[PDB]
């Protein structure tokens, strides 16, 4: 059935003495496919992943996790990146067994090889607070590289294309995710504002003000909520082309 998380009827709040920040959630995330969760700013996008991770409390609803029940090892990189005062290698490995081939495959997935070349002692430099300060796109790529290396089989991603250009975002789009991530069949959820990649989505869930709108596929969004489909056509400005 490949139902990764079958949260149904969920109602999630930040404040226990507050309104539910997320309303009724009935998402049906599949396993082994890329899915883009899209809303405006401040409409529950990161709050949904924090809900499915169990970090936010719920007043009702029932999460249905699935393994290969309880939530397994799921890799995740937040909006704000978080670093360890260690080497870049130890930051990306994150207490995993070392593999020189896959550390290479993620260093050319994330394309941090000129940055490790400009790094004054290469792989063994202390970064973070007690260490050399980085630019920020570098830290973002580090936080997604440690998510790549993790062997999670279910990975969560917040937006890595905050502090990247067009080239790094496309290199992270073509290589890395859907290339290193789907040949190993790793379930990936990705929130983004760059709508030019929701073409490459096996599933999309819409969201507005803590409420999810209808979920499904891109041909399903060609049918359902045509206001949102023409809004995504006009926003991507490839309005002549039909998005599939």
Query: Which positions from 91 through 130 interact with other proteins, judged by CB under 8 A?
Result: none
| Annotated binding residue 46 | yes
Q: What is the C-alpha separation between 88 and 134, in angstroms, rounded?
A: 11
Nearest CA among 18, 16, 12 for reference residue 60: 12
Q: What is the C-alpha separation between 2 and 154, in angstroms, rounded?
A: 12
Residue 222, CA atoms < 13 Å, CB-side half-sphere: 9
Strands (E), 63-114: 75-77
Cβ neighbours for 231, distance < 8 A, ≥ 6 positions apart: none
Q: Does 168 bind other proteins (CB under 8 A)?
A: yes
**Quick one: what does residue 21 bind among other proteins, ligand ATP, Mg ion, none, with the CB cut-off 5 to 8 Å set by partner type?**
ligand ATP
Please report where in the chains the tokens 């005062």 appear, as a residue.
Answer: 85
Q: Are strands 187-191 and 34-38 parallel, antiparallel or unpaired?
A: parallel
Q: Does 162 bind other proteins (CB under 8 A)?
A: yes
Q: Does 192 bind ligand ATP (CB under 6 A)?
A: no
From residue 193, give the alpha-carbon distance in Å to each of 42, 86, 109, 219.
Answer: 12, 31, 21, 20
Compose the 30-59 pattern: x for residues touching ligand ATP by CB under 6 A, - for all others: -----------xxxxxxx------------
Q: Are strands 8-13 and 22-25 parallel, antiparallel or unpaired?
A: antiparallel
Q: Does 14 bind ligand ATP (CB under 6 A)?
A: yes
Q: Does 143 bind ligand ATP (CB under 6 A)?
A: no
Q: Pick one of 13, 21, 35, 46: the residue that binds Mg ion (CB under 5 A).
A: 46
Q: Does 238 bind other proteins (CB under 8 A)?
A: yes
Q: What is the C-alpha separation between 76 and 143, in angstroms, rounded?
A: 8
Nearest to Mg ion of 79, 234 (CB atom): 79
Please state the closest distance from residue 81 (CB atom) to other proteins, in A: 11
- 76 in helix, strand or coil? strand
| Annotated binding residue 78 | no
Q: Does 21 bind Mg ion (CB under 5 A)?
A: no
What residue ranges bind other proteins (CB under 8 A)? 39-42, 45-46, 79-80, 135-137, 159, 162-168, 170, 193-196, 231, 235-238
| Annotated binding-site members for ATP | 14, 42, 46-47
| Annotated binding-site members | 14, 42, 46-47, 79
What residue ranges bind ligand ATP (CB under 6 A)? 14, 21, 41-47, 79, 191
What residue ranges bind Mg ion (CB under 5 A)? 46, 79
């Amino acid at each position: 059935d490949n139902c990764c998380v079958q949260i149904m009827g969920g109602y999630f709040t930040w404040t226990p003495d507050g309104i539910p920040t997320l309303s009724n959630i009935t998402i049906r995330i599949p396993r082994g496919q890329l899915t883009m969760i899209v809303g405006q700013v401040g409409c529950g996008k990161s709050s949904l992943l924090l809900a499915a991770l169990g970090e936010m409390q719920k007043v009702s609803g029932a999460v249905f996790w699935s393994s290969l029940r309880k939530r397994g090892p799921v890799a995740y990189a937040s909006q704000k990146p978080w670093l360890l005062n260690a080497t870049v290698e130890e930051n990306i490995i994150f207490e995993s067994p070392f593999n020189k081939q896959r550390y290479k495959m993620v260093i050319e997935a994330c394309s941090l090889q000129p940055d490790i070349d400009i790094l004054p002692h290469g792989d063994q430099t202390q970064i973070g607070e007690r260490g050399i300060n980085l630019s920020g796109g570098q830290r973002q790529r580090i936080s997604v590289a440690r998510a790549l290396y993790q062997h999670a089989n279910v990975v969560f991603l917040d937006d890595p294309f905050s502090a990247l250009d067009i080239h790094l975002s496309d290199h992270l789009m073509q290589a890395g995710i859907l290339e290193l991530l789907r040949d190993d069949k790793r379930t990936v959820v990705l929130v983004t504002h760059k709508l030019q990649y929701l073409p490459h989505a096996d599933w999309i869930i819409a969201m507005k003000d803590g409420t999810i709108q209808r979920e499904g596929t891109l041909k399903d969004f060609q049918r359902s909520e045509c206001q949102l489909f023409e809004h995504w056509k006009t926003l991507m400005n490839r309005q002549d082309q039909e998005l599939e």
